[PDB]
Subunit: 201 residues, 4 copies
Amino acid sequence: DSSRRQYQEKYKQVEQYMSFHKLPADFRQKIHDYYEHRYQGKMFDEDSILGELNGPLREEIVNFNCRKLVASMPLFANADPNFVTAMLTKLKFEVFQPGDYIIREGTIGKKMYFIQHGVVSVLTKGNKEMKLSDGSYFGEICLLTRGRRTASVRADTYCRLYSLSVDNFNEVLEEYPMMRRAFETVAIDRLDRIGKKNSIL
Amino acid sequence: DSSRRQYQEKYKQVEQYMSFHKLPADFRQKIHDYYEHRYQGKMFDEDSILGELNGPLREEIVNFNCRKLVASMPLFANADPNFVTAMLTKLKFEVFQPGDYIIREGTIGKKMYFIQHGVVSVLTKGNKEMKLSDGSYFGEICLLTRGRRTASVRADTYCRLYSLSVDNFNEVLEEYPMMRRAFETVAIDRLDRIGKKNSIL
Amino acid sequence: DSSRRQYQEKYKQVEQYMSFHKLPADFRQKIHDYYEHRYQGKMFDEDSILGELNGPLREEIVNFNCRKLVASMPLFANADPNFVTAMLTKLKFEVFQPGDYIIREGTIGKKMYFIQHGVVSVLTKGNKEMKLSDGSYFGEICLLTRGRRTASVRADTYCRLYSLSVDNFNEVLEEYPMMRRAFETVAIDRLDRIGKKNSIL
Amino acid sequence: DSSRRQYQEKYKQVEQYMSFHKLPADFRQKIHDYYEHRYQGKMFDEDSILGELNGPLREEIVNFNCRKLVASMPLFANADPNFVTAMLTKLKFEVFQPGDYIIREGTIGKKMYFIQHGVVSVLTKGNKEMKLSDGSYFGEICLLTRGRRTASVRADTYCRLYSLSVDNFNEVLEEYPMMRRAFETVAIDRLDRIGKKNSIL
Ligand SMILES: O=P1(O)OC[C@H]2O[C@@H](n3cnc4cncnc43)[C@H](O)[C@@H]2O1
Ligand SMILES: O=P1(O)OC[C@H]2O[C@@H](n3cnc4cncnc43)[C@H](O)[C@@H]2O1
Ligand SMILES: O=P1(O)OC[C@H]2O[C@@H](n3cnc4cncnc43)[C@H](O)[C@@H]2O1
Ligand SMILES: O=P1(O)OC[C@H]2O[C@@H](n3cnc4cncnc43)[C@H](O)[C@@H]2O1
């Protein structure tokens, strides 16, 4: 009722904004589809809801909502549950559409991404080309090295992702320094399958 | 009327969120009970209300609301009323449920807690085990030493607590340096009843 | 209509909050009176309103609203209008009730106050006692010296004041360093009529 | 419907605010006209709308909305599209009325402005006087030199501008250092047509 009504009302406002700015019909349809994939017909003031709770309830909720994400991703599945919880509570859900450039090579990276569902293409100017899918993650190398993105990453399907900002990534790896090395070893692994090599790792 | 309606409406939204994410029935009931204990059937935009007032009225209100807390806790009861008021105005009310881990040993501490009503268990790996209840406080040692939590603390009953963040704790002990020593002397006292000893105090 | 309704609705919420916390009848009446003096039966989301405007309109409005304040206070009346405008745009309107301690001696000062209407008493432990009224200001010495308040200041009547925070006071005196000396000369003047003397001025 | 209603309701609130503060009839009319020019009968919570989207959609929208601005301004039109997008996503739309002083000489500059539509006068005490119009920009020199504004700039017509804050201007020129030199070369050009000369450029 009230969450469904909230969705309908919020979408009406998006339509009037698009109408105001006279966006073309193909772009409006892409926004409509994004909305349906992202919100699935219900909208919540989530910050407000979880802010009404306490630490333990929020932590229980985020663990329940991400059981699949956690269990299918070896880095999370075998790690200390408190590190997991600390990551989970900082993740932000994002949806991307086919063809979207999630990350552009050469730019400065502010976040990494965990793939809950979807396939992405990792792209470099040197044509060395890979897929990542459910249970994997990407965008981490730049966070480790504070460098520039080492590849472009493009959505091949609709992608349901969870992102983590650089500040949060760093806040969490302070408390649990052991897990930084796990990311590095995979990062090194990945760079060496595309000709790169950082002294920094 | 309007605060009761606000509670009912806000809770409906929590139900639709829980329904959306398909939380199980036991967890929904725990959220329901938390809500009833925490808000007691009325909801307020408190920040907005007190922001409409001035310093003196806010200070009078917070002193009236915490008379019991202040009078039953020797550190507050015998202290300079301006220090009390300065602490009181920074406290945030929190409710925890039986079994909840309020604090985990080894983690980094961002806040301490004053028990208005309830019983908690202080737990260490070395089995040295104590209760704290109404009129006591905990979580202060880490704030004093910027170290890691020296114990776990678990709720035994429903707990009505007031928390104070590390930044506020520090802001207040700047203006009133005399009261830091009162916390330290009890902190030292507490560590020596569990085999620990900090040079820092 | 809508501002009057906003006032009535907001006050109803204050009543239910006071009722919830069981504040006594004398304190509720004091809150009622404060509300009537402060909002005068209409409420506005002012931040939102002025945020909908531009710099020039906001600056024209604040100059029109404070004509009396500006004209009756020699420091503002004879100063560069751009300095005035820059101060005015940072002022926050506050109402205090008789007996209220606006400032306590010994504490750390975060703001100064311009009296639009009312009388206040400047109080020191050494009994040296003065009145300030319409067109005057107070609380400035601490901002100049970053020291501790040199006196207490208490409301004798209902007081309509405009406050300026330490950060804003400093932001403005950067751009217009000439006006700091005007405050200092009056500050020095004031300290020497109560036995104090700062090398800092 | 809902955006038009939002406009009507928001304007009613502006009227009651103006009525409360007893602004004169000429100033009320100027506010009415500003409102009509600025919002054109519809209001949106834009931050909320675009926050509901993702990076790629926001970037597509801002590029579509500013096609004219981009195409008519050589600095944007011939630049790397990613630099353009990065600027565009930080621009804030502003409307000014004839006679408004957008910038005052001598003051400290916090933003620059891109003229989508309108004419402005660049004014200096030394009477050296120029017009800028659609496709041009101004207020950049101070951002480059962190100095004081080198001229006043006044609106001659209704002006539709996009502003960029100093922090954003700097954030963008970090990622794309090549474009700072393009601004400098025009800045130098401009200063030398009014007798000034900065070693800093
Ligand atoms: O540099 P980033 O922050 O942003 C681009 C990302 O692409 C991923 N990547 C790079 N070479 C790869 C080889 N194989 C799989 N994945 C790869 C990796 O997560 C990079 O992190
Ligand atoms: O280390 P913290 O920040 O977080 C865990 C808290 O447990 C409390 N504590 C430790 N030994 C204790 C012995 N007796 C009573 N209370 C005790 C004390 O407040 C600790 O502060
Ligand atoms: O120290 P503050 O920040 O806070 C207390 C204020 O009291 C005012 N004051 C002090 N001696 C005074 C003598 N005469 C008039 N006014 C006086 C002055 O504005 C002080 O600034
Ligand atoms: O100093 P600002 O930050 O603020 C005042 C602005 O006036 C513009 N300006 C100065 N001399 C000019 C000559 N011709 C055209 N435009 C001019 C230029 O953008 C200046 O940047």
